[PDB]
Design a protein around this ligand. Structure first.
Ligand SMILES: Nc1ncnc2c1ncn2[C@@H]1O[C@H](COP(=O)(O)OP(=O)(O)O)[C@@H](O)[C@H]1O
Ligand SMILES: Nc1ncnc2c1ncn2[C@@H]1O[C@H](COP(=O)(O)OP(=O)(O)O)[C@@H](O)[C@H]1O
Ligand SMILES: NCCCCCCCC(=O)O
Ligand SMILES: NCCCCCCCC(=O)O
Ligand SMILES: [Mg+2]
Ligand SMILES: [Mg+2]
Ligand SMILES: [Mg+2]
Ligand SMILES: [Mg+2]
Lengths: 224, 224
């Protein structure tokens, strides 16, 4: 096949998509699985004055494989407003709705030259891109596998299960992974006992990202 | 009919269930709609040393209608662990799984003596109560209407829409209401523009709690 494609979404913004995407791509590249990081849509950015956006971090890592990459090669719709993409676009660029057909072509083109194309979304699954399409719809159009990153705090059970319900209702292969931060041992006492019960009762278990680099690489590469 | 029953859930813990439940019950009582506040299951409490739990706040308000009420009349399963009810029960009371049939009877009994019975859940919809039942399942068994309180911060769009998807997939009447806090005007710039678009495109609109006391009272009392 051409390169595999893995979409990274989350329970919400700030859950750890960027952090976990970078860790996974680093691991894959270290294993000889040539992997690129893409951030097709990004809000809340000012590129004239700040070089620490998700796309900038991705670019730093990606340039270890291709010096010629620039920001515009890996991020295509970028807005100042710290909001959902649809709202940012309507306010800042009302004459250019986000074109997911175009994005699909650009993203799939990278499957020629990489073993794995990692595509970070923005916010969570239901975040609107166009009037018709949210982030999940975009992932579906891409025919990507899904990695959904959860936060590690009280409330993650609800947030994971809401996403599980939405994901299992659609036709895609997915995995939910908890981004367990350094210094959090409340997790193991408070939330983990339910994750373990859930996993004994589910065909698709919720995993801990930091325990799962090998498993998630395998997931990302399996099948067609 | 006997009194109506309204379940109050949320996007997650700390979104405003208790605060909004109290405001709604106060409004209803002021309008002559005799309303009780119940917190059947509560975690994270130590009643020997703290009298500020949701059930204690409810009790204060409820005693304006019935001096004889005590905590045990309005809250039935109470645990120290700051966790989902299922985990707290398994750790603190392994021989007494939460009995939702019993809770249903106790809650419905209040429909004899009140025009409206408001039942606050714990956390969000997918929070586990027993191995088989979550908070939504409990609300379904109760045959209550649902009021789902959302937080007012960046990310509410995703959280509201995840809940909308779950709720619309089940057989219950529901309303999602945003708990818009004092001093937040970012909401109106960041999130509200999408809520307005969504509402023009949806048969069941997302409302702002603080704008909606009359509407939510009407909702709670309508029909059988
Ligand atoms: N495992 C982690 N350990 C420490 N800090 C983390 C971890 N995961 C995320 N962070 C921090 O949390 C913030 C949000 O993470 P980020 O990966 O950007 O999330 P998202 O892409 O979902 O918005 C960042 O400041 C990031 O450095
Ligand atoms: N509209 C509001 N204005 C100010 N403070 C609020 C508001 N809503 C909630 N709070 C505060 O936020 C915290 C969580 O609210 P609470 O109603 O207890 O939520 P939940 O019942 O969902 O856990 C409390 O400290 C509460 O006083
Ligand atoms: N204030 C105590 C609330 C307990 C919240 C439980 C949340 C479980 C979850 O969804 O992870
Ligand atoms: N860091 C900028 C992220 C933008 C997050 C948009 C979240 C929309 C929502 O679900 O309410
Ligand atoms: Mg972010
Ligand atoms: Mg990110
Ligand atoms: Mg609370
Ligand atoms: Mg509460």
């Amino acid at each position: 096949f051409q390169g595999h494609m893995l979409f990274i979404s989350a329970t919400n913004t700030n859950a750890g998509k960027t952090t976990c995407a970078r860790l996974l791509a680093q691991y894959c590249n270290a294993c000889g699985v040539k992997t690129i990081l893409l951030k097709p849509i990004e809000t809340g950015v000012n590129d004239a004055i700040n070089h620490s956006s998700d796309a900038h971090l991705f670019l730093q890592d990606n340039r270890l494989l291709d010096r010629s990459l620039t920001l515009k090669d890996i991020s295509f719709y970028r807005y100042h407003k710290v909001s959902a993409p649809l709202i940012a676009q309507q306010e800042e660029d009302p004459n250019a709705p986000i074109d997911t057909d175009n994005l699909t072509q650009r993203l799939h083109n990278f499957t020629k030259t990489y073993d794995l194309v990692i595509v970070e979304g923005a916010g969570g699954l239901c975040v609107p891109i166009t009037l018709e399409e949210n982030m999940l719809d975009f992932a579906l159009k891409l025919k990507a596998k899904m990695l959904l990153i959860s936060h590690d705090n009280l409330g993650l059970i609800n947030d994971c299960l809401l996403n599980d319900f939405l994901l299992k209702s659609h036709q895609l292969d997915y995995k939910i992974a908890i981004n367990l931060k350094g210094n959090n041992t409340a997790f193991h006492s408070i939330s983990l006992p339910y994750i373990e019960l859930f996993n004994t009762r589910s065909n698709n278990p919720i995993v801990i990202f930091q325990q799962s680099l090998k498993v998630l690489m395998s997931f990302a590469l399996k099948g067609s």
